[PDB]
Amino acid sequence: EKFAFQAEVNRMMKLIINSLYKNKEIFLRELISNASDALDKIRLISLTDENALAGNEELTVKIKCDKEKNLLHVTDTGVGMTREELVKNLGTIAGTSEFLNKMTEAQSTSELIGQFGVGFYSAFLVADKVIVTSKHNNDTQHIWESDSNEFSVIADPRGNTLGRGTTITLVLKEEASDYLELDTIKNLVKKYSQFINFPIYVWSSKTKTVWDWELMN
Amino acid sequence: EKFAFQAEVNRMMKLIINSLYKNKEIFLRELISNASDALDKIRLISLTDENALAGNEELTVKIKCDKEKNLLHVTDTGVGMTREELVKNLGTIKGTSEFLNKMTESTSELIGQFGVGFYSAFLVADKVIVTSKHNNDTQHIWESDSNEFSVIADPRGNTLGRGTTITLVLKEEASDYLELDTIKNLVKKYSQFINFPIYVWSSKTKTVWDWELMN
Ligand SMILES: COC(=O)c1c(O)cc(O)c(Cl)c1CCC(=O)Nc1cc(O)c(OC)cc1O
Ligand SMILES: COC(=O)c1c(O)cc(O)c(Cl)c1CCC(=O)Nc1cc(O)c(OC)cc1O
Known part of the structure; x- marks a missing residue:
């Protein structure tokens, strides 16, 4: 159940963290962007697979804050990941050599990270876990x-x-x-959801005080 | 041939690098101290083993600066380490649980006390x-x-x-x-109290190079 990251991933996390410490808010752009990719995937699968959406009919992204617990949640109903995909997709990586060289060389890297698809790791810019x-x-x-x-x-x-x-x-x-x-x-x-083709909600309050999902795009 | 560090060691390296960020020279103190501890160990073993010192009869620490290659070398003639000991002593970590908590909660002395000063070489070294x-x-x-x-x-x-x-x-x-x-x-400065002789490969005036005793 316990694994170690691949060497290149440790290096990648360091490069990302060190070259974006000046524009941390980007972590949110990356999370929403990954949410959108996952949503596109299940949509593509639903073209050939008739039972694709049986587990959850909606295609959305729901963001919730929990101040008391110091937590931020970003939920999407995309394709999801199997146990093997979590281990492989997040703990290993597969033209990576060049990217690291470009990152190192560049060190704006905001665009580089987005283009390569490794934005997940920018979550460590604002999170201890x-x-x-x-x-x-x-x-x-x-x-x-x-x-x-x-x-x-x-x-x-x-x-x-x-x-x-x-x-x-x-x-x-x-x-x-x-x-x-x-x-x-x-x-x-x-700001980061303007060009995302899936509805994005944020659990918020409204005037008694009532909480409910609020569409952002 | 390839290994990954134990989670505790990764945490330890960060704690050591982030706390001593303002007094980097301390890495040299730790390398010399570890050198010393390796020498005490072979010296002890030699008390009960006639062939202990067969591989090298001296007990010293020799420091060498390779400016051109951008390298710093610290060599001791202590007990040394087997392949299994390199992997275990350097890639895994001993009251570690509390030490990490203590580090988090000056760290200079603490690191010296637990004996994990090796990792401070990363304060001044890329590799x-x-x-x-x-x-x-x-x-x-x-x-x-x-x-x-x-x-x-x-x-x-x-x-x-x-x-x-x-x-x-x-x-x-x-x-x-x-x-x-x-x-x-x-x-x-960091050798004043080391029981073994410490040398620095240095030059003297033509220009000649040779071992100079520092302690
Ligand atoms: C499979 O995509 C996802 O389910 C997903 C998501 O819905 C939200 C997210 O924030 C993330 Cl990170 C993902 C996973 C994205 C992905 O394709 N995995 C992945 C992540 C990496 O960092 C990576 O680095 C090389 C490679 C990956 O495949
Ligand atoms: C075995 O001791 C050594 O030979 C030695 C040395 O001669 C010079 C050095 O700079 C070092 Cl690091 C060593 C190894 C010291 C040791 O006993 N191993 C060791 C080192 C660690 O850094 C450590 O961290 C948790 C644990 C160890 O056991």
Whole structure:
């Protein structure tokens, strides 16, 4: 259940963290962007697979803040990942050599990271820990967690609560506490969701005080 | 041949690098202290083993600056390490649980107290190489950039006889440690109380090079 990252991934995390410390908010752009890719995938699969969406009919991204627990959640109903895919996709990597060289050489790298598709790791810019809960049509719900020094995968004792999809949960660093404020999240989400072809919601309040999903794009 | 560090070691390296960020020269103190501890060990073994010192009759620490190659070498003739010991002592970590918590909660003394000062070489080095020859094994080489490490049989064979050479590929901004003046100075400070003789390969005035005793 306990694994170690591939060497090149440790290097990649360091390059990303060191070259973006000046524009941390980008982590949110990357999470929403990965959410959108996952949503496109299940959509492509639903063209050939008639049972594709049976686990969860919607195709959405739902963002929620939990100030009391110091948590930020970003949930999408994309294709999700199997246990083997969590271990492979997040703990290893496969023209990587050049990318690292370009990153190192460049060291703006915001565009580089997006183009290569390794934006997930920019989550370590604001999080002391990253948790990935996923449910893929071909497997049971699993959980991936990491503080960047190793990672582990376990079967989710809660069972299948996602239906289909992925939740990226971030345990925010103390200095990243500002991302727990609704005003800030709504503003960032709105900016980074303008060109995403799937509805994106943020759990927010409204005037008694009532909480409910608020469309951002 | 390729290995990954234990999770605890990765955490430890970060804790050590982030706390001593303002007093980097301390890496030299730790390398010399570890050198010393390796010598005490072979000295002890030699008390109960007539052939202990057969591979190399001396008990010393020799420091060498290779400016051109950007390398710093620290060689001792202690007990050395087998292939299995390089992998275990350097890639895994002992009351570690509490130490990490204590580090998190000055760290200079703490690191010295737990004996994990080796990792402070990463404060001034982009890559760290450890060549070692133990009586019970052939010479091997351990190398790391901190993101992983590998251990290979030393193709040069037994050149140490017995002992360990710590080789640091100095970061561009750590280049100051390649100056004889500076290393001589630091060595003289952290060697005042080391029971074994410590030498620095230095020049004297024509210009000749030779071992100069610093303690
Ligand atoms: C499979 O895509 C996902 O389910 C998904 C998601 O829905 C939200 C996310 O924030 C992320 Cl990170 C993912 C996984 C994206 C992916 O394709 N995995 C992946 C991630 C990497 O960092 C990577 O680095 C080389 C390679 C990957 O395949
Ligand atoms: C075995 O001791 C050595 O031969 C030696 C040496 O001669 C010079 C050195 O710079 C070092 Cl690091 C060593 C190894 C010291 C040791 O006993 N191993 C060791 C080193 C660590 O850094 C450590 O960290 C948790 C644990 C160890 O056991």
